[model samples]
Target: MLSPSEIPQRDWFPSDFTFGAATSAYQIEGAWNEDGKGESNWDHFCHNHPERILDGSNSDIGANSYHMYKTDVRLLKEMGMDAYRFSISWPRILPKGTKEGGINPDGIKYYRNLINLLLENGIEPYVTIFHWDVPQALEEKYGGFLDKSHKSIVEDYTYFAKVCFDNFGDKVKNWLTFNDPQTFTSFSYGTGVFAPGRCSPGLDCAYPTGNSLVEPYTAGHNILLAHAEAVDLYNKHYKRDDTRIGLAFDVMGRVPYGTSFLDKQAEERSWDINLGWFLEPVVRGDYPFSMRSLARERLPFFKDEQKEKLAGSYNMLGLNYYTSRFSKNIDISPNYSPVLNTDDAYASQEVNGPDGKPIGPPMGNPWIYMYPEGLKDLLMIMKNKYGNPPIYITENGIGDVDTKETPLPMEAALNDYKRLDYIQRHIATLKESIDLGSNVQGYFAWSLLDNFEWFAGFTERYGIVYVDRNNNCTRYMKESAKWLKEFNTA
Candidate 1:
């Protein structure tokens, strides 16, 4: 592990390398109902079952970014970012989640103004078409992404994609079709913690009538088809010489628990389920071999036409990485039944390695254990196995817990030294991977501001800019943000 002072300077990266910050619409934007924005599944979930959320909080007025987007852009500029990656709210644009339902001009105006402002400040806007906020109308009509009936999801989502391209493609050169489809589908359909929450009956989920074994794959299959059709639409009608689009995948680096073959094979299978589940479909138009064999009859298949559309769908790839885990093999038996889709991988993730020591230092959060080397290893995997696609570090940051027992003052929160150290180590490792021939292109911090975190609510703060929840959502730059500003200047 490298010390904070040992991290490389910004100049160590290529001149064209980009540094930016990221945020999603539902996480940051308030005014959920204003400007003709229709109800999203999140709006429905948070309202109907607030108790499902740990803090019983909703994002109705998140950081209030919809009304205060200019301030958000100003913060991004002050941080000296080269780009700003944010998601467009699907319901905000297509209020009904379909073309026939009517388009909202106000939604278009909000994003167009934001994009113009970013460009005016010399910051490029990397727009994500969907960030898991499915329009409630779509969910009510045909179960947003799980609609396997005549493939309505593919048609509706592709139409939504074309609308975005036709409206914003002139100015926005970089686009991401979906952000973390695996996490989105798994959480939404498998675990039932996220919006449109559905899980196997008797599970502790909002809508407990889902089949955890099959619905996740069904949703994922549709998502992939939608992505393919969207890419095809772009290439046929909306693509320009400079335009580029891809999918953003969420990855938690996996490490083998021991030197034994079982542990190594478990690590590989973990990757098959985590990263390769989606990447394989896009790269080769099929699921990983391990997945096909293990999840036989449960995982969905791509059609011949779908395969052709999926292959070579993107010129770039967006990777969202945070932390790592030790993968230990799980015994599979004929009587085994899966509680979650990940169980099919026959592996369990652990914080401690075989030596009974943690894989790395804790980020003070229960979920994220800081392991910078995992990032380097993941990049090497991408280089050697995934053909070294052009890559961007889309989301990377540690979160802080603010609770009644250990409530942090605003001043104390602003001096976030731990986050500063976590980011520095990751940046250092990223540079190391680049030196070893990883086709890395850009990096974006997880978020620009502390906003609504799903389930956990605002307790986990992952942003460099602290959002003063009680103080009119005023933004304050943390020590990490200041460090990054100086680092960019240097």
Candidate 2:
């Protein structure tokens, strides 16, 4: 595949368009209890339930970014990135999960140092307040996100946001309230594959007592309330003309699996359930008609005031686009009883079509198909359908698989031509979307360094730079990093 500079190149994007890389606190920063860091839900999960992780690994020392953040910032400079998005670990700052429990000063110092370092080195810091790192204390206190009223977890989260805004709003011009709310809620409740794993009683997850079909919506409701509270706070207090406050949506672009119009409609419904489930709340202040009609009593309807708060709650939208799926229509017959919240969509999302062919070429991970147009398609939908709000491609990258049986050699891992090709295509499409009036301002590849992938653990490599786990988490440049450096400069 051709490199990015082969055609339009870096200068092709708008002069202000940003290029950056992203990493979450739990994934890359591993000082689980260092210097007063408290137990995040992820820490509890990985430490207690090691079997859930594919390679039986945890973030106890993930990439050692907690200690090597300087090296990470140096690498960002080496890459010529204009920005860097790193999530703030909620539990780290509020170890007890509430201000009443006392704030952790050491946690504040670490993040403050990191942000200052980024600014000093000319890299803009984009902060995400909650990246699924719920404080274990909160989880135990009030059952975490299961409480629906805007009183318990909602207030706690709002307070946490306030702390972040108070501390970092001045230096961090851009802030994301949460990352992948849809995935975080659903996987934690519906699929029971992620932290605080829960599902309907019979599932083989950490806790099967959860009503998978119902709990996800409740958690989702809480997230909307928390996001609105945070955004309202920022808009009223912390927002500047250039500073933005928003949350990132995890979107999977979808295509109809068949030639029929039903399948086409299915694609739209699929988007409604995945994207609209969260997007509709922020954009129009309620869940989509499709979701309400299907989910019915199981879905939570916002109070009028809550709806108002949710509507127009963001200064911008952050979309994390990875791959597209072929959405096959599922009939909503009584016989089609549902076991999961995702079933409400009445669509079957498949990576392969009925003819037994994959939607796009395979990547290192088994799930993510290389469909660059998916990102562009979502962008147009945002422009035409969602009032064209400012957007950032918060994350877009492919991963490399490295398991015991099929471990990728370190040299082969660093070559990374496929990753280079994938990023090139996505950035080119991002540029096209911008040209087509998508209001996109920035693009951040999924990560800066190989991290401990949640659930999948350390087996999936999504970084442009290889973090040698066996060698003190040494940061080494992969071909994609070199290509990005050249692309940024040229």
Candidate 3:
């Protein structure tokens, strides 16, 4: 593979195109259970279910970025990242989850230092409110998001954000409320795959048969309310022109298996349940007609006062899209029940496009098919549906595995050219979307440093700067980082 500087320049993207990288506290910052920090849901989940992690390793000391955030910021500077998108651990901040008790000053100092370093290196900080890390105290007190008590719990969390806003509101410009509530809620609450795994408590209540849909729906409802409440707090107290606040949703677009009407209908339903389920509630202030009629429980209802506060919530939209797959409508009639644990919406079987066609070269993960136009289609869909709101591709990237004993680290490091191509193609598609009048503003690669991929563990490396998990967690910049540095500089 060529070095990033050796790669030929292409003048495809427009002048205002955005470039950045992302990481989360739990995934990267490993001082877990350190410096007076309490346990988060992730720490608890990983400890309980060692079998779920691919390498049987928790992020207890995953990347050690909590102590070495300065080094991480240096990597961001090297990548020529315009912004660094990341999250704050709720436990790390207010370990008790309530406002009255003591808050962690060290946690605030860590973030304050990190943000200052990013600004010093000419990198902006884009903060995500909740990235699947709920405070353990809240989970213990109110059943997390499974019950209505979480509404007040979220209000407390927003108050915690108000603390951050009070501290660093001047420095941090972009704030995203929640990162992919659909995936996080489904993975954590509904599916037994993620943390705090719980299903609804009625009718077919067993290992896998109990209703998982209600928990995620209810959790998502709380998230929307919390996001709106946070935005309102910021707007009412401290609104600035440059400071932007919004919500991020994981969006995936798909093509139908055949040209049948049922397949088309299934695809539409998939979009509704996945993206529209959350967006419609926040944007249009209610659930879609299709979901309401199909689910029959009203899902979760918002109060009139909440709706009034939420009507004009988002100043921008953060979109995280990796790839899309093809779906075919399955016949689940007679016993036509909804698939509760996933955002796939029961549209098709969970498999790659037929025959593993390998439309492009394969990568570490088989699920993420490399189709950039699907990303563009998703951006356009959001623009068309939501009146062309300002959008940011908050997270998009590919991953691969590496061995410790490679000669040219590029062989392991620069070997990410395939992913580089994936990103380039997607950027081209994003440019096309912008050209076609979608107010797409910025793009953040899914990660800056390869840390932990949650259930996939350290096996799946998504970083431009590769982390040597075997030895002291050292970071090595791959060719993609170099390419992005110049890509943004040019």
Candidate 4:
């Protein structure tokens, strides 16, 4: 059973605090290869390797939001949300991934209409420049983010960021340069669960031609450079006093599994690998001291000028917190060796604590357990450790399982009490973090409606508004949607 909160979220949160829903371009918007849009890495991967996706599905016609974005905006309006965080598909804009590949007029028109409609409905549009949907053209050109040169992916990515800022900066006051950099790099290169899936020759990914341990770092370095370049460009040219730009990180709150100091050190190593991997570089213009020493030459180095562009690059930050895990210490000796990006942490994540009980109540999704306290702990870490910058909880929600073996019934989908509970508790924790001086500003639910779920495809649902695949992807509010509507009104 879910526990009740001492403080009501509506009464605790500030009036100026915003509430919204989030979605990525490939996840919701379909129209793949339509109206001058080029092929994305996702489009290529899913189309080529349907066997890799859990449901054997692709985002070619995802939620059909490319044609039905108005309905999405209407749902947000009906739910009384204050902001909408959506991404701009790089392939859609620059069909060939670079400016020389030529621009797509229809792609620009689509985003303009979407942004304008959000404004018309009194919703602030927080645009993300890239959300893992790289142009396949770029991937083929020089291995996308794998290129370790200044005249390659870094330049192309900065150009794409500039394109968005140049066109949408007038209307979109907030921007995210990249979403989930760690997840994208590691999943795509190390684990092979995402697009451009390439892992070690023996690992369980679709394409296993790359080095699992090394490629992720290479990809991550390129992404950091790209982010620094984009942020510098934005600050120098497009930035206004009212406008802001930053990156969103996917941080899974971590706790030590034991009471020993070694376990505590494991917890720190976990943070250094996960959040600190990117945050330290963006904040202080270099990798964490722990990472530099432990990872040694495996990590990439930034130039003095690049560090200048990266440090103090962002005026705000967005953290996407979902759940927490227990980190157990794995003492490394002469016998231990690192083979994967995950192994670099030297701390294995556990869903259960020492008593063999789960960390929190299990949700419909097997991976995530409901743990609101983890959100507060992470907020405090950001405030106390990393110089608290204004933050928006860009993505947070529980996923419901829906596979061929056990398809979710329509009645069950609409009666999403777990999601409703998950939303309430996390929001309550957000209010708590704010009260604790966390510099938090806003919160956005993971999604407006169920769409594509990356590795899971359509096998997991993380939406307040359930999308009826049988009904032309029509949306219907579940318990979470109704509760949030009332909560926002309060």
RMSD of each: 1.2, 1.2, 3.4, 1.2
Q: For residues 215-275, write the lDDT of model 3, one tens digit per residue.
A: 7777777888888889889999877987889888987776666678988887777777778
TM-score of each: 0.98, 0.98, 0.92, 0.98
lDDT of 2 by residue, 77-99 (tens): 98999999999989889999998
| lDDT (CA) per prediction | 0.91, 0.90, 0.77, 0.90
Candidate number achieving the greatest lDDT relative to the actual structure: 1
Q: List the residue pairs that clash in candidate 3.
A: 409-413, 410-414
Q: For all candidates, what are the clash counts?
A: 0, 0, 2, 0
Q: After superposition, how far is residue 472 of candidate 3 from its true place, in Å?
A: 2.3
* Per-residue lDDT over 73-191 for candidate 4, one digit per residue giving the tens place of the 0 to 100 score: 99999989999999999999999999898888899999999999999999999999999999999999889999957459999999999898888889989999999999998899999
Candidates 2 and 3 compared by lDDT, better number: 2
Ranking by lDDT: 1, 2, 4, 3
> Candidate 1's residue-wise lDDT over 1-490, tens digit each?
4555697699989999999999999999989999899999999999998998877899999999999999999999988999999999999999999999989999999999999999999999999999999999999999988897738989999999988898988999999999999999899999999988899999889889998888999998898999999999999988888889999999989999888899999999998899999998999999999999988998877889899999989988999999889999887886666689988889999999878889998887679888989889889999999899999999999888886667778887899888988998888888989999999999999989998888877778889999987888999999999989888878
